[PDB]
Design a protein around this ligand. Structure first.
Ligand code: EMC
Ligand code: EMC
Ligand code: EMC
Ligand code: EMC
Ligand code: EMC
Ligand code: EMC
Ligand SMILES: [Hg+2]
Ligand SMILES: [Hg+2]
Ligand SMILES: [Hg+2]
Lengths: 180, 180, 180
C-alpha cells in the first residue's frame, strides 16, 4: 500500500499544488519528479530532495511571481502520506558531500515538530534563491511535516554546495527514516 | 537461536537481577521491558535503551535505596547474551535527536572495553538521578559489556534531553552493531 | 556478476600489481587478502581497508624499496571493478572507533574525484610509514578511484589509532556505498 498524498492551496496571488509518493513498486514502478516553483534554485533543491529521498513528487506553484509556502505544502503532503507512520525506522541520519562541502541531517519522524540548523552561508542569494531563506524553508518543511530535524553544514565554501549537500543529506536521512 | 542471558547479584544492602534478550521472533514474539532501579530517571533511560535497541530487558534492583552497579549488571548480561559475537555487524553508529538536543553514539562490539564521552550537563541532577553519574553509568555499561563506546552530545540545552538523546543514540548504535 | 579488476604497473625501479574483488558469493566464497607494499604499517592499513570494506585484495609492490603509487593502483583497480556503478547505494558514511580514537568517512561514489580531510597527527612517522603521507595516500586513492571523499579524525591521541580508525571508517563507508 503506497503512501501517497496530495495538497492544493489557492490565494488571490498564488496557486500551489503538490502530490507526493513515498514508495514505488520495485522493478514495476519508478520515481517521477516535476518541480516548478518559479525559483530555479529551489526547484533544484526540492528535486534533489525527492530523488535521493526515494520519493516521487509533483510540485507546481503558479501565479505572478513567499517560497516558504511551497516548503509548507511539501511538508504537509509528506506528513499526510506518512499517515500512520506504522512500521517505519523512524530515526534517520545521513551525511552527503558535494565536492568541498559536507552536510549532515538527523531526523526523527515522530509527531514533534522541531528544527535546529547550522548553515553558514556567505553570499546573499544562491542563484535564483536567497540564502537566508534556506534555513527558513527547511524549518517550514520540518514544522509542516511534523518532524524533528537537525541540519548541519560540517564544512563548505560554495553556498550552492552547502545548500545542495544539505538537501541531499536531508533526503538520505528521510529515505532511511521512512523505510519499512 | 535467541541471544539471552541472566545475571543476579546480592549484597547485604542490595539485590540486583537482570535478564536480557537481544532478539525476537519476527511477527511471533515481541519486546518486553520492565525496569525498576529505585531511580525514576535511570529507569526511563534504561527503558529507552532497551526499546530503541530492539532488546527485551528485565532489570530490578531491590533493597534499602551505587546505581553504577545496575549499569554493570546490564553490561554483564549484554555481554553474556552477545556470547560468541559471530555474524554480527560489530560496528554501529547512530544519531538521535530530542527536540533541541542531538547526540551520537559509536560502538565497536569487540572485546576491548573503552569509553570516551562528551556530555556537557548544566544542572546537578536530572530528575531522579545525578547528572555527573550519567557518564559513569555509560562507562560502567561499556566496561562491563566489554565494548568500545564513544558518546557525544552534539548540542543540547535541557539536561534531560541531552541524557535521553544519548541513551537513544546508544540504543540505535547497539541495534545496528548486534544485528546479524 | 562479481566486480573484479586487475592493474599492473612497471618502472625501472618498481613493479606494482593489484587485483580487487568487490563481492563474494555468500556462503560459497570468502574474502582473501594479501598486501605487501614494503611498508609494514601501510600493509596493515590497506588490509584493514579491504577486510572491513568487504573486499578481496591482492596488492604487491616489489623492487628496491613513492607509496602514493600503490594507493593510486588500488584506487585504479577499485574504479575499474566498480565499472558501471549501476544499482549501488552510491553514498556511504561510517564512524569507526579504536580505543581512544574516533574517525568518520563520507564517500560519494560518483565520478567526481574530491578529497577533504582533517587528520591531526602528532609524530613524524607511524611505525613503518610517515604520517604526513597518510592524507596523501587517501587523496591518491580517492583521486584514482574517482570518488568524493571526506575523512575526519573526531578525536585521537595515538597516531597509529588515528590512522587505523580512519582506514576502518573509510572501509565501512565504502562497504555501504558499493552495496547493491
Ligand atoms: C515562490 C516560490 Hg513557491
Ligand atoms: C531556526 C533554527 Hg536553524
Ligand atoms: C540505585 C539504583 Hg540500581
Ligand atoms: C570517562 C570518559 Hg566520558
Ligand atoms: C613503497 C610502498 Hg608501494
Ligand atoms: C588535501 C586535503 Hg586532506
Ligand atoms: Hg510560484
Ligand atoms: Hg535499588
Ligand atoms: Hg615496493
Amino acid at each position: 500500500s503506497e503512501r501517497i498524498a496530495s495538497v492544493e492551496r489557492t490565494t488571490s496571488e498564488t496557486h500551489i499544488s503538490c502530490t507526493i509518493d513515498l514508495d514505488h513498486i520495485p522493478g514495476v514502478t519508478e520515481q517521477k519528479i516535476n518541480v516548478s516553483t518559479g525559483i530555479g534554485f529551489l526547484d533544484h533543491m526540492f528535486t534533489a530532495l525527492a530523488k535521493h529521498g526515494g520519493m516521487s513528487l509533483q510540485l507546481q506553484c503558479k501565479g505572478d511571481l513567499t517560497a516558504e509556502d511551497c516548503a509548507l505544502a511539501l511538508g504537509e503532503a509528506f506528513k499526510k502520506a506518512l499517515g500512520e507512520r506504522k512500521g517505519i525506522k523512524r530515526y534517520g541520519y545521513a551525511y552527503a558531500p558535494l565536492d568541498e562541502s559536507l552536510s549532515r541531517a538527523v531526523i526523527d519522524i515522530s509527531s514533534r515538530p522541531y528544527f535546529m540548523c547550522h548553515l553558514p552561508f556567505t553570499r546573499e542569494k544562491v542563484g535564483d534563491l536567497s540564502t537566508e531563506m534556506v534555513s527558513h524553508l527547511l524549518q517550514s518543511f520540518a514544522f509542516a511535516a511534523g518532524v524533528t530535524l537537525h541540519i548541519d553544514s560540517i564544512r563548505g565554501e560554495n553556498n550552492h554546495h552547502i545548500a545542495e549537500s544539505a538537501f541531499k543529506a536531508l533526503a538520505l536521512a528521510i529515505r532511511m527514516a521512512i523505510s519499512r
